[PDB]
Structure formats: C-alpha cells, structure tokens
Protein: Spike glycoprotein
Amino acid sequence: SNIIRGWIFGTTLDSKTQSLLIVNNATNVVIKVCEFQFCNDPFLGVYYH
Amino acid sequence: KNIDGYFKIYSKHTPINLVRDLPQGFSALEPLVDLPIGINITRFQTLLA
Amino acid sequence: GAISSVLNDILSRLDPPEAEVQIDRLITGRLQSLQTYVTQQLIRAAEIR
Amino acid sequence: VFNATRFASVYAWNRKRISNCVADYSVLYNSASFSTFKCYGVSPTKLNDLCFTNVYADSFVIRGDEVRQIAPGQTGKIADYNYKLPDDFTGCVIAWNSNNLDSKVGGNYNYLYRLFRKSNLKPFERDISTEIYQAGSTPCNGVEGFNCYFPLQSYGFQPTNGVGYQPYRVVVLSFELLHAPATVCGPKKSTNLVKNKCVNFNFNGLTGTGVLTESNKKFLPFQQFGRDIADTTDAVRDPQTL
Amino acid sequence: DLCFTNVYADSFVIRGDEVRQIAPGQTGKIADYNYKLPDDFTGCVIAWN
Amino acid sequence: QCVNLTTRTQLPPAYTNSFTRGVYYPDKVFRSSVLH
Structure:
C-alpha cells in the first residue's frame, strides 16, 4: 500500500546540525538538505475514505 | 551509505508473494541516483503512512 | 600497486612524466607474473621429464 | 562558476552539478587569473582528450595563505575542519586571486570561516551549524562566555593588507572516471564509426587499439564500460545512438 | 659536481600567475599554446620577480 | 507536527535472518559471465 514514504538522515536529528530528508509526497520524489526542525514522529496520513 | 561525502543509493523493485518472514532469494540492486549531500549521518528514522 | 590495472587507463589519464611512474609498475607486475609463470612451467617440466 | 559575482563561504560552499555540456577551458583564457593549477589524479594535457562523468565544482573563497591546504592529505582550519578532500581524490584544484572584487575598503565580513570544530569530519562535507563550541569543561548552553567561542569568524579583507591575507577564489573539480557514462565532454570533434577493422578508438576519453563489432550484450542504463577477466575494457556503449 | 653539455637559456617574461605552468606536463596559455616543455625534459626552471 | 501518537504499543525488538540480501553493483561497470 506504499506505506514506506522516506527517511530523515541526520547527525543528532535536530536543528543544531545539517540533515538529509528524502521523502515522497505522492507527486515528486523530494530530496532536500536543509536545517530542519525535526519532529519526534514524522508521518503522512490519508484521510476520511 | 555515506562515505567521502558521496551518498550512494541502490534501488531494486520486484514483485513478490509473501505473508511473513523475508524470502530466501536473490536480487541485484541497481543504483538509481547519486546524491552529493555532504553531511554526517549517525541516526535516522523512517516515514510511515 | 598502481592506481589501476589497465594499461589503456593510464595512457588516457596521465602524462608520460606521470605515466612512467605508473606504467613501469604495470610492466614490473606483468614481468614478475611471467617470471612467476616460467618458474611454474620449468618446475612442472622437470616433473614431466 | 569561474566568473560569478559573489561566491559562498567555506563552511557552506555551493556545489553546482556540471552535467551535459562542453568542457572548454580555452574560454577562460580570455580573462585568465589562475594562480595555482594542480590535478592530482589526472593530468591537464589530457583534459581535451579524456572527459569526465560527474563534474562537481567546489566554489568558495578563503585566505591566500591556506590555498595549499586544499590538497588530499593536508590540515588547517580549511582542510582539517570543514573542507576535507578524500584520500582517493582524483580531481583538479583551480584557484586564483580576488583582490579587485572581494576586497572592501572597510572590510568584507560576509565570507566567514570555521575556526572551532569538535572532531575530524568526513571529506566532501558541508557544515552549516552555528552551535557554540565548548572549549572547556563547563556547558556553554548556546551562549558565549569563558571557553565558549563562536565558531564562525571572519578574515580581514582589505586591499592594503598582505597578499597572503588577500582572498583567493578557488574552484575544485571532482569526478568519477573511466567507470561511468560521461555526460560532459570537451571540444574534441568526433569522427566516423568504423566496424570490422583494427582502429584506434576513443570512447568517453578511453583511448586504445581494438576492433569494433556488434554484440548481443544489452547494457543496463547506468552501465557504460564492459570489462573482462583481465580487467581491460571488453565492450563500450555508443553515447550518441543506442 | 655534475656539469652539462649544451646549456640553453630560455629567457622570456610572463604573468606571475602562470609561472607554475612552466613544467613538463602542464597547460595554460603559456604551456599548452606557445611554450611547451618536453615529456622527457631534464632541466632546471629559474624564475624571479 | 509536535503531537505524537498515543496508540504506540511497546513491543520488544525481535531478530530476523537474511538469506542473501545486501548485494549491489559496486560500480557502473558492465561484466558478463565473470566472477569478480
């Protein structure tokens, strides 16, 4: 069901370091290297079927 | 893997028929892209839907 | 001990000032291989004779 | 890349992917300023004969005293701390002077550098972290103080300083070579393809003597060169037509 | 201690950025175009301001 | 973003065997009927 969406590759998983974020938002394969505000539980949900 | 600041990814997709524990088989993984991320990766997570 | 095993790579990469450092490593590696092989043949020919 | 307006700093340096173009270094000789020019893994006379797969330009501005630090196997505040080159670095280093543009009368504080780093990071790595370095035993808690120094300082960029203190621009080229399909190849005109005759072939810079025949081998789309037991190139792929 | 047979002086004036180009196996507007040194060049290069 | 899930059940990290997984092409080079 395409549940694996991507990863977050970082050092400390925080804004104190530079991290990789490879995801897929069902349109484009998004690969970004930014200073991310890391959430404790990243997810992408589908709603109200 | 991230060695010498050169993130190598290797992708392989094949159809399977599986309920349970990882199948006894073989598949040669092929490189898709090459990402010059230039970071340090020690910890990571995985997105789910 | 050289940067590569192929003679055609060093002829396509390095100058003859920098290739004689590298090709003479290939020549010595191939001559010692032949001096290995002729040693293995003469001892074997002494066994057959 | 070489004639841009403003470069980036050394801790965060722009890495523009050079793909699908003609590597002609004779265009740069109209306005040439190249002070040092060293290719460690390759030779500069083969730049027109040999061509490269994935050319990456490493553009940043540092102090003129630390240009020799950009080398595989050196240290410094540039080499050991933020911009490290690999041990197997097969590439070229192109650097030149920038007194006429990057020197300000008052001072150019926009070009920062990393002076305090905790450990020895991996080569080809960028570091945009602005965390306060802990030089002592007390926790810094993200503020400055005793043994708590801000890691990003700036050089003195004035045209009246010493020439070793003057900012030198630098662009370093890195590539994978003779294993991958080549996208960037320079202004050497290709010739006709001759089959069933012993010729002197040149495929993506790889020169040698061989016979070109058709085959039933089907290469993968990421594969260019076919090799043998003896490790020599047994088959290539035509980059123009499939 | 060693002395030489046919010493030839190569006297000219170029830009200060291109002095390292005078070497066996380099390029430039001086090395590649008009003043080229041989691959088997056994000699000395003396330059000054 | 900051809101975490509440249906997470603490379960022990069990172990799994792999048969022959983890093999990739080390470079971009074609090879035919060889053992490299």
